[PDB]
Design a binder for this molecule. Structure first.
Ligand SMILES: O=C(O)c1c(C(=O)O)c(C(=O)O)c(C(=O)O)c(C(=O)O)c1C(=O)O
Lengths: 205, 205, 205, 205, 205, 205
């Protein structure tokens, strides 16, 4: 990543073994559950494109997902090149193409040059956005259940049902009441409109 | 978070893999037991709003709770906007709205600008207060037992009973004596008024 | 905590995830065995009152103990206010009350101001003393056995007996010989007065 | 490795116990699965040739692989010497031979001298390229299955089949449709040409 | 401990949670096996007397040993006071007594003052020597077996026997041949005088 | 060890708990498998003689090996004294004897003085060489099998056989073909001379 040193200059630092292991382990344990995306984003804080490829490339499983991700990245790269055509002046900085942002045709030094320029050409942040776009599609693809099929069991605590409901809604990216069981549905219908989730949860507790 | 470097300037630092993992693990292991709140507060020391959302968003379970939390945050944000209406001067700092404090409509750079201003506009601390307000409501909601139902068993050591009593009181946010078993109740009644907890515990040991 | 930076100024630093976890784990594993107190003291090196409350508040169990601790803290705070009555001059430092030392009515900034003043008003150290006073009372309360009941078994190695003896004495805060078994008692009686523990242990080995 | 200090000079640092352990553990757990190579590359960020040999030499198993790697390294070293023949001026820097790049005939001090020269003679990066060339050959050798033999089972979810397919293709370094089972093959044939992987995966979900 | 900062001044640093845990764990796992002493010495590098007491006091078991250690420390302290009698000049440094070196009657500030004086009065190193003296006595006391009773079994590999022999000798603080089994004894007798351990081990392999 | 600080001076640093634990654990898990030596060398990067003794002395088992190591060290020390006889000028640096290099008769301060002199008298590196010489002898002694006895089983994959072969050769410090099983021997004989290991392994795959 690029970080501020103690003196206050923006310097490149090696990606840490702790960061590398954290990402690999979270993918092993959580696959593409929605909460993996904000973990990815936080673990890649200050990442160069090189770092971002490192993180993606260190994943051993899920190669169907990783191939879908490349497709998304290539679509975003092509759209970048459409909006940002490029024409080298000796010792000067060239303008990044899509594949330079994605780290496949740019060097680490070029990446550092862009990201620490004044003003910065934030190739790490641009690439991270494309990756997250791609990961969101994967999360939704691998979401196993429609919210229409999240219905409260006859003996299921309301809390547990609501957990399943909003878990599913998050992965999928009135119905809460309609899908409740008969006893809690009746209680919730008599709360009237504009009840908060807290009030519903209290009511069916 | 925003931290003091070695030289003494307030700089942004990436949230650490250790911090991220600690929060996720404490929620996995403790759910919304009351002691999770001071852990949250300590793990988010110096946090930007971005960091605070990261921590909340990396939680995979408990989505009923996370949705209740958003409701609380939105109520606190709306009350902020009521008390702090906002009117951009080129190169100048805009005033934060509720949704800027909550990190949903403000950039990391804006957040850093506010938090390191002289005097600081402490958007991380303001947001953390709203979050803790929300978490406290959740702790109380998920508190399983009334203090009225914490009663000492016939063979239950007084210490163990008092542990359950104050554990419950903490989650719920004279009765100690009334809920004691017959033998310890008699001992405690004869200590008279103004006995300390230490003296009660000694007496029934 | 407040620490010396690399340059040599006294700066506030966030309490680390490692420190937080170490304290929580030691309480989980050891409860109020006497050795927990020096661990507490070492883990809270340079602690502000805020840090000290964090450590105490992150403990999930033992709420009978934590309530006894508050009582001790309140007694020490009241005695502080008796010896140190307080009368704000714009931009000047106010004098700390007991509840300010205990971190319940003082801000982090006030705490830093006191602890880094020249000379320092060491509110973290003062509060830590009160807490340790309280923890010592708890260790003694939870000490399960009188030293009078630590007696050497007929087949019990002398070393193991002495371990139990001094373990108990430490928790409780001639008898070694009297409580020894008949065979070792006879050996120890013939060593005469002024035998070291080493010599006794050698003698009964 | 060679790193930037806080002041901004390029200094040698000892390889960390964390880095050493991470590499050894990844080889123990993953052997020569393709994802081990980007992990190697990231763990050896800023590595001297000495560091690179350390990492390779700390591997206890897989000595057939490590011997094949030496062969590749020696071929790359010989090709370096063919393109870069060398002729010592007192106190001056000598030009590196292949075996100097590979760290077998150069000292740590010579390596640091080359890597921190202006412009740098990047012996660590040159050697890392040769090593990765060698590791790629090993990954391919140890790839157990031809892509021709990755065929979807009659009850096998399409996702799981695609995972196996691209996993195999990666190790090996239209067919997706041809190797699908009859039911999904029919669905995929009716999508027509130019279907994305996402669309295929959606179609057979 | 007292350490050199980045600038090069001798500063106090808090004892780390990692150091504290390492010591406690090594005592839990190894008790007073001889190798615990060099681990102690290395873990207490730069330690103040306060740090040294912390390490000793965090040990929960082995209180017979810890009491023997105090006896040794008190003997060394008394001998210090015999050789170094002491007579306070306002703002000046007082001379340390034995109990000041042992950290029982000196403050952390006094300890830092002595250890960072020019020339240093190395109270941490002096105390560490007394502690190690004490620990050595304990290692020897808890050594379970005489070297006279380490004899090679009829089927026991010579290597394993030599391991037991020198393990015992280390704890206890020609015979190798005499205690060997008949077959290896005969081989070793025919090597003649001045055989190295390597040659003996080769001979009986 | 001696390290470069952030400013760029060569300073002494305490050996870290992580380093100490890594060495102890690698010896526990791997004993004197050949790969332990490069791990030792990397873990003792920048080590003083004091640090090197610490690492060796913290090993609890393998005392036959540790005694053989001392013998090797004493032979290397005696040869040092033969080549480097020594004659103290007030405030000046004395010349190191063999036992000073081995850290048994020199102080930490003397060691630092030699290692940071201009030019450095690299006593840590000199001692490390002697230790590694000694460790190599031990690796070879504890090598359990002659390369003559590594022969491919009738059903043994060629890869697994080659792994055992080069593993053994490494510990021991044409035959590959001769020791292959009949079927692979025939294949390898028909490749002709100058086949690479890769080509042999491909051929028998
Ligand atoms: O191994 C490290 O270099 C390290 C250490 C460490 O010195 O033990 C610590 C640490 O002080 O405990 C920390 C840490 O602050 O938690 C880190 C870390 O930043 O994660 C590291 C490390 O860089 O790995």
């Amino acid at each position: 990543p690029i970080v501020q040193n103690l003196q206050g200059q923006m310097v490149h630092q090696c990606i840490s073994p702790r960061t590398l292991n954290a990402w690999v382990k979270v993918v092993e344990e959580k696959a593409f559950s929605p909460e993996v995306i904000p973990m990815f984003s936080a673990l890649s804080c200050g990442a160069t494109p090189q770092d971002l490829n490192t993180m993606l490339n260190t994943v051993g499983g899920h190669q169907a997902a990783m191939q879908m991700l490349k497709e998304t990245i290539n679509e975003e790269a092509a759209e970048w090149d459409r909006l940002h055509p490029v024409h080298i002046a000796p010792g000067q900085m060239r303008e990044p193409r899509g594949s330079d942002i994605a780290g496949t045709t740019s060097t680490l030094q070029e990446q550092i040059g862009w990201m620490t320029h004044n003003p910065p050409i934030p190739v790490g942040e641009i690439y991270k956005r494309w990756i997250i776009l791609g990961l969101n599609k994967i999360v939704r693809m691998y979401s196993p259940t429609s919210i229409l099929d999240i219905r409260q069991g006859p003996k299921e605590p309301f809390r547990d049902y609501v957990d399943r409901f909003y878990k599913t809604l998050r992965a999928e990216q009135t119905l809460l009441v309609q899908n409740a069981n008969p006893d809690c549905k009746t209680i919730l219908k008599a709360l009237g409109p504009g009840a908060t989730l807290e009030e519903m949860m209290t009511a069916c507790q």
